[PDB]
Symmetry: none
Subunit: 75 residues, 6 copies
């Protein structure tokens, strides 16, 4: 009496070519950091970070993404 | 009596060529940071960061994305 | 008695060529930063950041996106 | 009583920077050279140079001298 | 009593920068050269140069001298 | 009483930086050279040089001298 057919089809490409990929950092400086605290009070958690230089460097040789999500649902 | 036929089709391309890809950072300075605090009262969570230089560098050799979502739903 | 047929078709391209792709940061300066606080009160979560130079650099060798959403829905 | 205190402070910098130094993406490119020579007669000294590119950096200068003299004398 | 104090402070910078220094994307491009020579007679000294690009940098100068004398004397 | 105190302080810097130094992506490129010679007669000394690229760096200079004298004398 009833049929439900979920037959989606994906042939897609997510692609790259690239030549030379380069990153250079040449001398960065984090300068002086100074902190002074007196009579502070806290009543739920403290999350902290202190520092002269914070660096993140992500250099993927193709950083390509495919996200697919499929739902068949009854509620 | 009833049929439901979910048959979408995807041949799509998301693509790049590239020659040389380069990034240069040449010398940045974060200058002096100074913080002074007295008698602060905090009643819920504290999330903090202090610092002279904060760098994020992201250099994907092709950073291409495909996002697709498919729903067949009854409620 | 009833049929519903969902057959969309996608042949799309989203594409790039490129020659040389280059980014140069040459010497930036974050100047001196100073903060003073006295007798502050806080009653819900506090999110803070202090710093002389904050840099983000995203340099994709082709940063192409395809976003598609397909819904068949009964409620 | 008598007190004599000779205490000069030198924190000076004397700096020389000569020649090519901090260039970024310097790409000197010499094109094609052709020499065809026929039936030439040389009756005295020949000094000959042929070529696409000379990329010479040449520094007879850039030298420093610091001369500094100190005297304390009672006579 | 007598108190004599001699305490001069030198923080001076003497700096020389000569030549090419901080250029970005310097791309000198020498064209094609052709020399055809036939039946030339040289009865005396020949000095010859042929070429597409002379990317010479040359620094006889840019030297420094600091001369500085100090004297405290009682006579 | 008598007190004599000779305490000059030297923290001074003499620096020379000469020649090629801190270049990034320096890519000198000498193109093709061709030399054809026929029936040339040389009756005296020949000095000959052929090539695509002379990437010479040459530093007769960049020397330092610091001359620095101290005298304390009673006579």
């Amino acid at each position: 009496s009833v049929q439900i057919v979920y037959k989606p089809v994906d042939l897609s490409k997510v692609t790259s070519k690239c030549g030379s990929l380069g990153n250079i950092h040449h001398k960065p400086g984090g300068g002086q950091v100074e902190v002074k605290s007196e009579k502070l009070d806290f009543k739920d958690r403290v999350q902290s970070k202190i520092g002269s230089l914070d660096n993140i460097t992500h250099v993927p040789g193709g950083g390509n993404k495919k996200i697919e999500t499929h739902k068949l649902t009854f509620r």
